[PDB]
Amino acid sequence: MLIAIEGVDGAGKRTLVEKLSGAFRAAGRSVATLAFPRYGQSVAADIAAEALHGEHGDLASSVYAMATLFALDRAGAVHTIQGLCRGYDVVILDRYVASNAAYSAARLHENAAGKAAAWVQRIEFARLGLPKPDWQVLLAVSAELAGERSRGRAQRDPGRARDNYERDAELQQRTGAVYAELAAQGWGGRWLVVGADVDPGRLAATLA
Amino acid sequence: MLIAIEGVDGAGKRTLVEKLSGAFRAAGRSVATLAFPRYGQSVAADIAAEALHGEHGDLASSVYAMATLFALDRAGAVHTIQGLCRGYDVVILDRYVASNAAYSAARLHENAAGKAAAWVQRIEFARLGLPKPDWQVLLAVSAELAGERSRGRAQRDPGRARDNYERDAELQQRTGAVYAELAAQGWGGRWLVVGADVDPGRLAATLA
Ligand SMILES: O=c1[nH]c(=O)n([C@H]2C[C@H](O)[C@@H](COP(=O)(O)O)O2)cc1CO
Ligand SMILES: O=c1[nH]c(=O)n([C@H]2C[C@H](O)[C@@H](COP(=O)(O)O)O2)cc1CO
Ligand SMILES: [Mg+2]
Ligand SMILES: [Mg+2]
């Protein structure tokens, strides 16, 4: 089974991933995890990160260019995803194809039914062959609370300064609204919306 | 030996490549050839082409985004280049790293000493590890004559319509001027400037 954890920056995805993986393991299932962007593992992922922190000229100014780098990152991990799925019972991902739809739609002030989300659909799933997730969990959180966690993370960790997207409070709010639409739409597969208080044991029972 | 054939669109590079490869073979050396962008062989190369023909939203509007896709294309062919160099005596390329410097510098109205050309240097050679060419041949031609060949190619071949760069006569002229600077500078390795009348036999003797 392939599970994707989605949400805005500072929503608390990586933590939910560690709590979830533990719950599945306390249930007897082997678990594997992968996080996108795969920093350090692919040039596409790295150039993208550097671009969000101000490098590579006008790269980050193009909404479609950024989406492409993130998609090229995933395209390079297809065999790896399939391998993990064959050998493990559960595979949890920290962000997946839906992040590209939500952020791209939000940067262009479009909704989940817009052209950007449809573009991601056509390129990543149909063309690049990334397998659709069995489940997509949306850790819904107030934009204010999320931004607060992102700002705190930057204050206490020099190698964790916020990037362009994280400094745009408006983009984070719109992205939140697009995510909520994607879920109700069942975009790319079935979704499950949870909050900060979601119980890891029950949650893992819903996804089992 | 690694040889790169550079020049503006319609300069006549592919033809010089077929005439050159024949001259080396008539000299007893095995020859191998590769052309960039590697259309059909890599997603990066294909998205780039589609973008130049009007697809993928605002992608082609970013100078650095296009340069990145072309570089990602090459990055994926490094092992292939090295393999060809080990097994063959001569390897001729239809366009290589210098095209990214010339076109990028020209789109930004910079010269060969500008930041764009320096960026390509840092990312493709130093970071991605593409081997520098032993020789870089610049097929210098009048911008007018080149554009004339590009327009004729489009009239007689439906699958050969000009792309964005080819329709910009001003970009083609500036790109020509940047190329001439790159050569005099010996950018990326030694250069050889030739014209339409260059003799394939002698030329191949200079590169032998
Ligand atoms: O496909 C994507 N599209 C996309 O826009 N992103 C965004 C989310 C962030 O602002 C950034 C990477 O974020 P992070 O390292 O916090 O997961 O890029 C991330 C991905 C996944 O790679
Ligand atoms: O690195 C590059 N940078 C770059 O700007 N180009 C340009 C030249 C063209 O206008 C186009 C591809 O051209 P062509 O198929 O005629 O070789 O992209 C081509 C390459 C090589 O890939
Ligand atoms: Mg982030
Ligand atoms: Mg061309």
> Using CA atoms, how far apart are residues A103 and A105, in angstroms rounded to an integer?
6
What is the secondary structure of A3-36 as a DSSP string? EEEE--TTS-HHHHHHHHHHHHHTTT--EEEEES
Quick one: how far is CA A171 from the chain centroid? 15
Return the number of other C-beta atoms located less than 10 Å from residue A29's C-beta. 15
Please work out whether the CB of residue A24 comes within 6 Å of at least one atom of ligand 1: no
Which candidate from A59, A63, A68 shows the least CB-CB separation from B47? Answer: A68
- The residues placing their C-beta within 5 Å of ligand 3, an ion, are A 9
> Using CA atoms, how far apart are residues A11 and A121, in angstroms rounded to an integer?
24
Residue A193: helix, strand or coil by DSSP?
strand
> Which of B145, B68, B142 is CA-nearest to residue B103?
B68
Give whole-number Cα distances, A58 to A3, B25, B73, B110, in Å: 34, 44, 20, 15
Q: What are phi and psi of B36, to 5 degrees?
A: -115, 140
Topology (CATH) of B1-208: Rossmann fold (3.40.50)
> Using CA atoms, how far apart are residues B78 and B92, in angstroms rounded to an integer?
14
B113 secondary structure, DSSP code: T
Q: What are phi and psi of B193, to 5 degrees?
A: -100, 125
b/e per residue B177-197 (b: at least 16 CB within 10 A): ebbbbbbeeebbbebebbeee
Cβ neighbours of residue B148 under 8 Å, at least 6 residues apart? B10
Data resolution in angstroms: 2.0
Ligand nearest to the CA of A175: 1
Distance in Å, CA A22 to ligand 4 centroid: 54
- As a dihedral over the C-alpha atoms of residue B88, residue B90, residue B93, residue B97, rounded to 10 degrees, the angle is 100
Give whole-number Cα distances, B76 to A93, A97, B31, B41, B70, in Å: 25, 23, 21, 10, 10
Residue A43: helix, strand or coil by DSSP?
helix
> Using CA atoms, how far apart are residues B144 and B169, in angstroms rounded to an integer?
8
Contacts of B56 in chain A (CB under 8 A): 64, 68, 119
Strands A31-35 vs A2-6: parallel, antiparallel or unpaired = unpaired
> For chain B, which residues make up each domain, given as ranges?
1-208
Quick one: how far is CA B47 from the chain centroid? 18
Q: Which two tokens stand for residue B123?
A: 């990312």
Method: X-ray
**Residues B30, B90 contacting (CB under 8 angstroms):** yes
**Residues A63, A108 contacting (CB under 8 angstroms):** yes
Interface test with A, best of B43, B100, B110, B130 (most A CBs within 10 A): B43
Contacts of B103 in chain A (CB under 8 A): none
Please work out whether the CB of residue A150 comes within 6 Å of at least one atom of ligand 1: no
A139 secondary structure, DSSP code: E
